[model samples]
Target: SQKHLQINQRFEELRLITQDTENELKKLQQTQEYFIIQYQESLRIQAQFAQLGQLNPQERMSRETALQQKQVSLETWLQREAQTLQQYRVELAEKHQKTLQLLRKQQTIILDDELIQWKRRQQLAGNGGPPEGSLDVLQSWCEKLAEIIWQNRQQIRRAEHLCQQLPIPGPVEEMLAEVNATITDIISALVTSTFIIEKQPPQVLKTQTKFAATVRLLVGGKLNVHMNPPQVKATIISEQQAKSLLKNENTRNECSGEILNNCCVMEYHQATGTLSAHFRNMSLKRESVTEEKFTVLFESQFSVGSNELVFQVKTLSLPVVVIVHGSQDHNATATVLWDNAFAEPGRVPFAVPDKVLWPQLCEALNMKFKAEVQSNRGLTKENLVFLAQKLFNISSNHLEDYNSMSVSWSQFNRENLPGWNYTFWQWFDGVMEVLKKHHKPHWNDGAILGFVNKQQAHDLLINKPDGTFLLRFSDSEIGGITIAWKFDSPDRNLWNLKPFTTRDFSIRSLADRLGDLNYLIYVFPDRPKDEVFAKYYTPVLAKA
Candidate 1:
């Protein structure tokens, strides 16, 4: 832990040193530029003496000698300043050694830890999980990297120019050139890494429908490229086109389809210190077929300080499945989820594993449920056990046994469960849709014993008093929730009402329905039903 703190302290020191050196280097340049002007004046005085044959000899010789003395004085001053400038250059370069080392260390953490984590979030988002989050924090880190790298770059360039002006001999030239190369490397890495999608287009992209996304250049403001903000062009590219782009192939600007209003000029946010292009109301051309995967390509060009350096930056968004109708969204989502979960880093043309570990699939499912309900509450071990039983047709309560199992893509979504019309994912996704619409509050309050089977529901309520009930999803139908209650305890009689659907919730809130039923008294574990659901009931209509 102290090592981390030590690293951070050193990074802070590095930043301070870089700023100080930049100011020092600026002073050196000012001094050198003025010295050159004086040198030119001395040269002009010598030229005047060479053309002095038209004057009185003694007067002319005395004036010429005085001028010669002045020239000598200027030359002497020039020599001392030249040595001073050289020393400053050497010291700045020496300081740069430390700056570069720290920059490398810091960049590694930002790229490997922060950036990698964001990418993982993006991957999970394809499975209906929470977003990757804002890029402001990531962009700020990159801007600092860009700013410091460019400052060092400018310092080294100034040093190189001074050496050229004074014709310094020996290892200084070689060393200065090496510094230039290293600083160049730093900037190149920052530029490529910071060009990213802030908000991804919907993975289930529909033709002839408006969609929006945001692209950002993290180093744009720090490099001062905001003065001449670049225009970003979004193009719909096929998998082949994306592959070619990555391979640096010289294909003739090929794209799969056109997108209306796809061009946006990047804007610099003065308040936020962000440079981004938001593409709103962009519509894809309607000439596409359904279920074909494509990616949106965002490309822009940025020129740093005085056009001395230029970067052609581009980034590809997460894969999207273009669909023509709402009917295809279900299958399209399956494609995205599978690709996102199983796709390897830098894989070829949208490839993913045919199957993945059950544990990996469980994580994705949990993320989806938590995000769908927009709640901190997520699936518990018991909920996961129910899924495991439903999927593998197993009766084992051993959670560890599921870890070794593997689930294929087909098993996840292609085939229906025995005696059911919907596949495993279809049933799960249906419940997610219902929860998102009606039961988020109830789920958050732990009023629902979701994901339990009828047998579990009966087992949970049979020991309780009459009118004791628990809410659970329907075993026989998709997107259905039922109220299972104990009607009598002596005979252990149980009764379950018909499962309710999203349509029913739209007509009446679940709380009002529970109140209307009036037979359900206590929730499982003996909490009063009204205590849990009353706050959620719609207000009674006031009398006219």
Candidate 2:
């Protein structure tokens, strides 16, 4: 009965297999028909080419060439048809194999079901107990099922991983097309219009002068005068243009002398148009003076407004006569003294000595000279008396001028203090006293003491003989006091009795000692502290 049942099941599976094979064979037949149709269409296209070749010998030559091309295309199409037909055969074979596999799988399921039924019957026979080893067999079957499930899960995971690795399609071609379009548009726009700006050369004019004169002009509705001192030269803008023309030869010069001068004189001018220059000379009192042969010329058109016109005059002699020609009358009588002193006493020859002498001479010759000289003498005397008073206060009759003069003479090696005169020290003391009195709260009484200390220190450093000494013994004493306070020592050993190599120490020392004690604050009415400090200490320190 078991054998019969197995055979019957096999027959039923065979029937299903036959049906599936039939369906696969039908699909293969359809694929074969598709290839045959493609092959016929390719042949038809080739036939049309051959017919065209026959109709036109010259056109036929071209047609023949095209027909030749179709021959290759037809062969390729035929090859494709063959490949498709071969693929269909392969697919049919695969389908048959799959049908056989399905039949086998069904057979296995039938056998498994029969085995399960047999086991159930046996277990029932043993009074609901499983047959010996029946449970082990069932467990083995269950394990097989678990392995299949695990394999299916692995396959699913593999498929998902492959999908994730696939690349996303990008619009690269589309972006390239957009970029090309933009570039073409830009190039087209550039080709349409392009501009370039360039600067051109300027034109100029020329002019000359002999005597002192002034270039008169109307600027911004006001008559302005450019005074040309004697021996000085002035050039009109026209002269510059003429010069430029002469230099270049090919280039044309433009612009008036007044305009050129105006450009130089004033920074800004709004008005435009023609401008001119009128030359004239005046006396010391600004009186109009006349010259014998004064010539003027107008060359170029100048922009209107204030212009600087330089008048250069070559004087014939020292203190040459400069006459201003009036517009109203040619003989306008205005006699101005033009001093052609190339060297103004002390200011001549461009030397420091000359500058120093001239100013000093002028000061000495002035009406206030005698008064200043007398006042200074009186001040010197008063200062000497004051020094006597201070010394007398310290020790009675200790610094009597008569006795001091005798001792000064005896010690007058002259090298230590060559200009050692009681009067000199007296004058020095007077100056310091005056400075202290005038400066008041801002000035310290100890300033004189510090100055004397520095003087003594300077003398020691130089190591000069008594005769060559520039400072007095009293001045040296004051410097000593300054040094003592500065070095922050009472012994005064750190204090250089001679001049200091570093003068800054004294200033710093002064600041440290007196700076806090005195409220010598300078409150500039409208000035800032930083500005004051910058002007004084910052620049000095920067140099140091």
Candidate 3:
């Protein structure tokens, strides 16, 4: 129903009414205040007239009668003014009640729907998906919430002031009390919803390595919170601590480990109308190569409207797997990827589906693969088909045969690939690592037939010319790239070079290797090797 946008239209209307009613109430209150002051002056004059004992008796009586008439006139006007002011206060309260209803409605759409979706994207970003979108829209909506609620609260308070001054009759006092409660509820929702993490810390957190994140208050500036900006504190808390925090149980503000430079004073930018605290140069002092998951908690206090409301707002960062060594990155990322790919919305801390549909896992894999290689050449159907065969241990060449299949977390990483020393994820990470470091250009050029197996490569090249060849990742070696070539004339033999790992590619690129082997004359399907590989070849070094 596009509820978010529809709610925005409603929000604009509510904002206008809120402003209009506030102005009307202020004018009414001011007029009543002035009328009361004039009425007091009249009483003071009447008293002074009575104290003039030297006046002639007839003159004094006449003067007293005239003053009494004037006093009666002022009292009559004051009575009408009080009635009108009461009516105005009731009318303003009613309007505020309407505005508060719409504020709650719109705030729900933004926070429950839009903001929750953003958090989902953030969860997926742990697996290297696209960055979660900008926060500007959410910020604007939240700011509007703050602006309207505050204006209406002020109006309600002013109405209360008017009643207190003149002691109005009827239900004005009771209605004002109810309006104040509703407005307070609106403000509470706003304070909680507006506090969010704008930029997420690295989900694959590495200890002693500086990383930065930003937390923002979408309504901070609108509430004039920058006048006495609050300080935000960041702490790394274990999964259990996070659970306790969410349950409103006391964790005693415990931290899993220290982070240097964790405290930041929120700043307000006048030009951008943004209030944020950027936690830069923060390093997890984890000192752990542990596999456990933890999240960073950012907490702060906001005093709104002359301390009328004080709110303690806190937000949690996406789950992070802290590591100390480069070697731990792959396994740590595996933990992050599995969680990101399969975690259910609104689940408990760090809980994820143990098994997910094959297609779901495939999408995550494709996203991660493309991101790791820094190229948009994602895994194709053939690649997924081969991956399905390898992971599911199936022989189906047909892609649809695996459509309804599911892959378990154990199959993904807990168990080793058949007869292999490493898990499927480990092997896949190796392919990505090698491709990113060496073969991205060739991969983007479609020169590498990356997913083909030894048998597929044979079937592809055996019928071609004597020097026909293709490239495939090695089945046996992790992070290995290999060349399979055919000899069609003599023995119809297919030979594969020993797989080249990242170390090998560091010395010589794949193109140069193709050029160095004279027998590898044509890529499979009859394209000349020179035509495909020459452009990527390094320039011949000048003789020293």
Candidate 4:
């Protein structure tokens, strides 16, 4: 029978599904039944009525009085214990800060005025002097210290006049060190803050969850090192370039209709030494680069900045390639990739890539894309993986069994569509019918891949923390990738596969190109003589 044909794939899928369904059924029913039986067994407890229960009014009043006395005693004891613990905690923290202050005083300073300097103050005060590392008197004395250290800096022009003004300069280096040390100690003591061991799980490494604590910084909650009136500099200013382009007055659109921007408005704060890029337009994120990684190469001398991208903008639509320079020097020449506008668009035709020099840009972009995929160590844990063998047919015709030599469709796009009697549309429609019955009043656009307006998309899809969007592609969907990042695109940009049909080729664009070449070379492919392009991408092999 046709239903009982010797094909194994269909039967295997059925086996896995039924097995999965039964396995889950038993697990759930077992849990449900087991919990219900627990209530079935706990027959006498009467948990709902137990609290308001069974004691008579006469005995209840006496019992309540006894409990109230115990509660009062417990509250008093807890209050005293809390008060004592806080005092101990503060004393211990201050002691720790004193130890830290000791270390801060002697970085480059060679202090010898340990006794000679403060001894004068101690003599006048009969009771005691402000203790070492004390913020009290030392804080007031800080001006003299800043001045002394300023003078100590190597051979000031005033060094020539110092002999007449002051006498007996024994070991100027020692004086310089002590003065600097006193200044630091005073500053450290004057402003105090507190921190507590508030533990949290790491965001990236989940297995590192147990027994881990992250120290937070604030004034008292999380002791933050305030950029005490931070030395602010314009790290970057919004050029007309790091831009927000809703449309170009002259050039037409690119990347279909993708929206992108970057914050040219970056500010540097010395207090924290943190550079924050303040974005001003269409909300999007750029990919992450590490501490000593790529800087945004743009015109305008916006303080030679080292940068971290705030978000994962997968496209260069943020408007720059702005290649990552090997060094921080922005003036140092490096490759800046062209826009569709770069090659004269008062007339506009386009492009680059020829010399040992000109970069193969398409290959360059896919390389960048792959790096993003690789950088995500958790990406494979994700559902979609690249395969070398097959491709989805985007043709209008849904040829089911017409496997003539001219054009054959593999079981690529439609996972279960065996090219027997069933067409791709049949498989899709059947899946749709099954899901339509099961959607449980599902939200429907009443069309497939026919997009809802942006307003409807906004209604259906949530603007998630990572920006893009979250929406079910179909009501049958169990899960989905964001519906914007290459969501319904990749069809317009085309590639031709009329090149070396052999030799080293690895990466998606070409592997898929070879899959496209199947009608041309139907048999087992023979090894080729030579190669064309060096997968211009320097791929960092990653673990799956």
Top lDDT model: 3
lDDT of each: 0.80, 0.31, 0.82, 0.26
Error of 4 at 518 (Å): 4.8
Sort by lDDT, top down from the best = 3, 1, 2, 4
What TM-score quantifies how close candidate 2 is to the native fold?
0.17
Better of 2 and 3 by TM-score: 3
Worst 10 residues of 4 by lDDT: 381-390
Model 2 Cα lDDT, one tens digit per residue, 134-189: 23332223223222222222322332232233211333223323433333332222
User: What does candidate 4's lDDT look like per residue over 341-437, in tens digits?
Assistant: 1222111111222222111222222232223222211112111111110113233222232222121112322233332343332333333233233
Worst-scoring 10-residue span by lDDT in model 3:
487-496
lDDT tens readout by residue for model 1, 28-101: 77877887788788788888887887779699878888888997898888788778767777777777776887
lDDT, residue 114, candidate 4: 27
Report residue 144 deviation for candidate 1 (angstroms): 2.7
RMSD of each: 5.4, 44.3, 3.8, 35.0
Identify the superior model by lDDT, candidate 1 or candidate 4.
Answer: 1
Per-residue lDDT for 77 in model 3? 82
Query: In model 3, what are the clashing residue pairs, if there are any?
Result: none
Global lDDT of model 3: 0.82
